[PDB]
């Protein structure tokens, strides 16, 4: 689960090319890739 004001950043950019929004885009990318990094092995752990 991702929170509010968390995918709305990942859809479009309400600003025009700001660095803090690059940091704010690389944070949500990680908060959405990390859970995948766990659930891709979780259904291997189910076999254990």
């Amino acid at each position: 689960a991702i929170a509010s004001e968390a995918l709305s950043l990942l859809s479009n950019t309400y600003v025009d090319g700001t660095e803090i929004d690059s940091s704010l885009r690389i944070r949500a990318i990680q908060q959405m890739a990390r859970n995948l990094r766990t659930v891709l092995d979780s259904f291997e752990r189910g076999t254990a």
Partner: peptide, 22 residues
């Protein structure tokens, strides 16, 4: 502390006389 190696993203050994136990 450094901030520089993170702001880019977004020798010798002497012997001792000791008492070794495992």
């Amino acid at each position: 502390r450094g901030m520089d190696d993170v702001a880019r993203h977004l020798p010798v050994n002497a012997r001792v006389p000791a008492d070794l136990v495992i």
